[PDB]
Design a binder for this molecule. Sequence first.
Ligand SMILES: [Zn+2]
Ligand SMILES: [Zn+2]
Lengths: 56, 52
Amino acid sequence: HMSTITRPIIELSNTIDKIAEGNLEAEVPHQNRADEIGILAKSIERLRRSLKVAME
Amino acid sequence: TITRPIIELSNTIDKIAEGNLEAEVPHQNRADEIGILAKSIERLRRSLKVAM
Ligand SMILES: [Zn+2]
Ligand SMILES: [Zn+2]
């Protein structure tokens, strides 16, 4: 549980902070996971791209 | 208590990505890793909203 769920939730939280802190090229890990971590990662990547477009 | 809130937070991120910055972010006061993710989503939301 700590390695399969806790670790990637912490990593993806950090990714969100990087994005919020203006780094709109932040790496977003785990987009190819088939479980709920993948749903979250794919959601974050769509966010990242949406914010890059909105930066103009 | 892990799967459900992770999907719920993902949906909140999708609302934010689509321009709905009034999305209510659940689970901000949880003490585990879901609380960590919820706080980070709420900070991003607030920064987007204030900027716009
Ligand atoms: Zn990882
Ligand atoms: Zn919930």
